[PDB]
Each structure stands twice: as C-alpha cells, then as structure tokens.
Design a protein around this ligand. Structure first.
Ligand SMILES: CN(c1ccccc1C(=O)Nc1ccc(S(=O)(=O)N2CCCCC2)cc1)S(C)(=O)=O
Ligand SMILES: CN(c1ccccc1C(=O)Nc1ccc(S(=O)(=O)N2CCCCC2)cc1)S(C)(=O)=O
Ligand SMILES: [Mn+2]
Ligand SMILES: [Mn+2]
Ligand SMILES: [Mn+2]
Ligand SMILES: [Mn+2]
Lengths: 228, 228
C-alpha cells in the first residue's frame, strides 16, 4: 500500500499528536511501499536552522522509515512552505512540487496540499503569492533566528472552490485527487474529463489521525483514534 | 476483523448504492469474523410481507455471507424498525436489541443505531416512543399491504446530545461506542468512567460507503468510494 497523510500541525505544545505520529511511523508506515506527506507537517516553520528539538525528533523518526526501505515524500503546506533542502537531508524525505501526478499500481492520481484550490479566499491567495516569491523568502531567511521568531509571534479555513477542483483534475487528466488543507475528511464524487471522478480529503491530526491507503484494487480514507 | 456498517438507506430508486453494498458483501465481508449492521439498512420498511424484490435480493446476498461462516447481526434504525423475524430468517441475520455491549477480542464496545442519543429532538423521540409501542406496530402490520404503502407514501437529522452519549457509555461502563444515524462520519474523543473514551460514527452510503473495522489491536473508520 501507498500512504498519504497531511495536516499534522506538529508543535511543542501538543506532544500527544507527536506521539501518535511516532506510533504511526514505527508501525503502519514500515509496511508501506511509500509514504507521502501532503503539507502542514508542522504548525509553523521559520527555516531549517531553527534548533527546535521537535524538528530533529521528527526528522530522525522519518529517516528511520526511509532507512527501512520506505521512501517518504513531502509537498509543502501553507504552514510549512519554508521547509528546505537541509530538513530534507536530515529527514531522508524528498521534496516534491505543489502538484504531482503519480502512478499508483497503474492508477493516475493528483496530489497537492489543497490550499491552491481555495480560490474564494483572495486574502489567502495574495498572502501565498507573496510568501512564494523567492526574494521575499530569502530575505526572511537571511534575518537572525531571534527576529524571525518574533515575526512569527506577531502573526498571532475556506473550503475548496468546486470549479478549481474540476480545473485541476482536468489539467492533469486524472480521475483521482488526494489533498488536505481544509481539515474536512471526506470522499467526494464529481465529474472530470467527461467521467466519474473522486477527490479524497485527509483530516487534521487532533483526537484522531487519518490516512489515505492506496492499493492496486482499492482507495480507502481511514481515521484512527490515538488509543494505545 | 469485525465490521460495522449503517445507514445504507437501500431503495429501488438507488441501484448504484445496492450494487456497492453487494460488492462489499461479496468481497470485504467474506474475510470478516462477523458483520454488524447498525440500522437504516433500508430507506423504509412496512413489514416483512412486502414483496419488493429488492428485499429478497438483499436477504439472499446477506444469507450467502452467513452461509460462508460469517455471522451477521442487525440493530434496527428509525427507518427500518419493523424488520422482523421473517426477514431475519430469509437473511440469516440475528436481530439484536437497541443497545448491545460486545466483547471484541477483549475490548468492550457499545453498539446502537444512535437515534436514542438525539435527545434534543423531542419531535423525533415522541414519534419513536409511539412506533415502538407493540400494539401500534401490530395494528399497522395487520392492515392490508396496499393501505400500509399508502400510509408511508403520505409521510413524505439532529446530531447527538453530548450528555446522552456520556450517559450511555457510563451505563455500560465502556470506553468505546460505535453508532450511525447522524450521517456525520467521525472519530470523537470524550471522557467516560473517569477515563479517555471514543465514539466512532459511521456514514451514510451515497457516493461512498463506510465501515468500522475492529481488530485485536486497532479500531478504524474507513470510507471507500464506489469506483469499480
Ligand atoms: C489558511 N491560513 C492563512 C489564511 C489567510 C492568510 C494567511 C494564512 C497562513 O497560512 N498564515 C501563516 C502564518 C504564519 C506562518 S509561519 O510558519 O509561522 N511563518 C512563515 C514564514 C514567515 C513568518 C511566519 C505560516 C502561515 S491559516 C488560517 O491556517 O493561517
Ligand atoms: C430522523 N427521522 C425522523 C425525524 C422526525 C420524525 C420522524 C422521523 C422518521 O424516522 N420517520 C419515518 C417515516 C417513515 C418511515 S417508514 O419506514 O416509511 N414506515 C414505518 C412504519 C409505519 C409507516 C411508515 C420510517 C420513519 S427522518 C428525518 O430520517 O425521517
Ligand atoms: Mn492544515
Ligand atoms: Mn493547510
Ligand atoms: Mn440513516
Ligand atoms: Mn437513522
């Protein structure tokens, strides 16, 4: 099976979610063919030089999975778009583009975080266009750590636009889309490419985790409580 | 694994949902230890003497499962409370009470349809108390079929009360509850019996089916599209 997760929003203040993630990594993930993390792995990210110990605990847990023969992949979310090549290296994770078209046992599937589908929030889209500008990023990342922390400190979810969904599945000519961002776990049926299509939406990790499990014959969205 | 499903609302007008159910019965269900159907298997029921061919197609598909060594069980919903011992016999299904406390590989779990938890709808609860009165049922069931059909024809969802949930899990001293009715698939965490508790809610069958799969170590809520 190939596994997809998203919207863990991992942080120092929620160790319970972190332990549920580490349980997942040490059991479920080890049996998989591949693990894809579709963004918002972290609640925030101000650069790979942050010495936050949570960041290394996570990179090490993912790296163990990678080193067991299970490739892990990462698509950025809106929370963690600054995750960079040094984190990739520490984690063993391969950074992917904002949209990837995969081939899972013969089935073609589009993966993305899902924030780009939220076209009714121009407030957000304006923000995203800015923070995706490389010179703006590199500016931020050139600041001393202590100034970046204070900038984030200061800065303290629209559903998808149905048409944006259809447009994305039609650009890639796919009948399957997996995404997160919206925190509304569900399987949807629509039409794309003159045919039945499915959009599978992952949940955020709070009381429960969620994953999409793709096998040769089946696609399942699975929720699991943190009970052990 | 032990499987739980609910809220299929099967009917003549939705053959697609019926085929998705029959797929499920012929694959997934055959590998299970037991299958529990927690109510609203049918969109309506006016008695086991209804000759609706859908009713026999379903009973035969369930009976095949039962005859393969997989016991099936049924708790009534609000839609199909008149399902009776003749349908049980045709289907091989065992009729259970409105609340059952099960033992699944050592774990104690409460199952119910879930309409009884909806105590903020007195409109419904009044209705339910009436249609659960045996003399009222037997009256209805004594009518000629054609009159019952016309009575149903004339008759053309509140979420749970959180306290009613806690009260139910505390009456049975359980940390696990599985139910349907509300059509809001989710895993919830609460407190019961001074401890962590989980309520797992099944979805209705529309574009997707849903099931709770209980194994010795895990409880998962699974959604699956009808894609094959
Ligand atoms: C949907 N999100 C937004 C909606 C409208 C506008 C902005 C956002 C948004 O993602 N904001 C946001 C705020 C802070 C972060 S951060 O990781 O702390 N960091 C990014 C690098 C610059 C400093 C801030 C990352 C993202 S939300 C509600 O989750 O924050
Ligand atoms: C939650 N349900 C109710 C809410 C308020 C009041 C009543 C109901 C309700 O379940 N009504 C209802 C109506 C008809 C049926 S029936 O199967 O067709 N049949 C039952 C036997 C008597 C004749 C009608 C079964 C149930 S709902 C909205 O699903 O119908
Ligand atoms: Mn998120
Ligand atoms: Mn997001
Ligand atoms: Mn129902
Ligand atoms: Mn119901």
């Amino acid at each position: 099976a190939t596994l997809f997760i998203a919207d863990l929003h991992l942080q120092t203040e929620e160790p319970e979610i972190t332990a549920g993630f580490l349980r997942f990594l040490q059991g479920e993930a080890r049996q998989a063919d591949a693990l894809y993390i579709l963004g918002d792995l972290f609640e925030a990210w101000i650069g790979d030089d942050d010495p936050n110990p949570l960041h290394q605990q996570i990179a090490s847990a993912i790296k163990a999975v990678v080193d067991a023969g299970v490739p892990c992949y990462f698509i950025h979310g809106n929370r963690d778009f600054l995750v960079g090549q040094r984190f990739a290296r520490q984690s063993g994770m391969i950074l992917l583009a904002e949209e990837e078209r995969l081939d899972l046992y013969g089935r073609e599937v589009l993966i993305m975080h899902g924030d780009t589908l939220c076209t009714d929030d121009q407030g957000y889209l304006a923000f995203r266009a800015k923070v995706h500008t490389p010179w703006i990023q590199r500016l931020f990342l050139a600041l001393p750590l202590f100034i970046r922390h204070r900038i984030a400190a200061r800065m303290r979810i629209m559903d998808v636009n149905p048409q944006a969904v259809v447009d994305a599945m039609e650009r890639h000519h796919v009948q399957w889309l997996i995404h997160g961002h919206t925190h509304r776990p569900a399987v949807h049926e629509l039409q794309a490419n003159g045919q039945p299509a499915w959009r599978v939406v992952l949940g955020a990790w709070h009381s429960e985790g969620s994953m999409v499990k793709v096998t040769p014959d089946d696609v399942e969205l699975i929720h699991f409580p943190f009970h052990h």
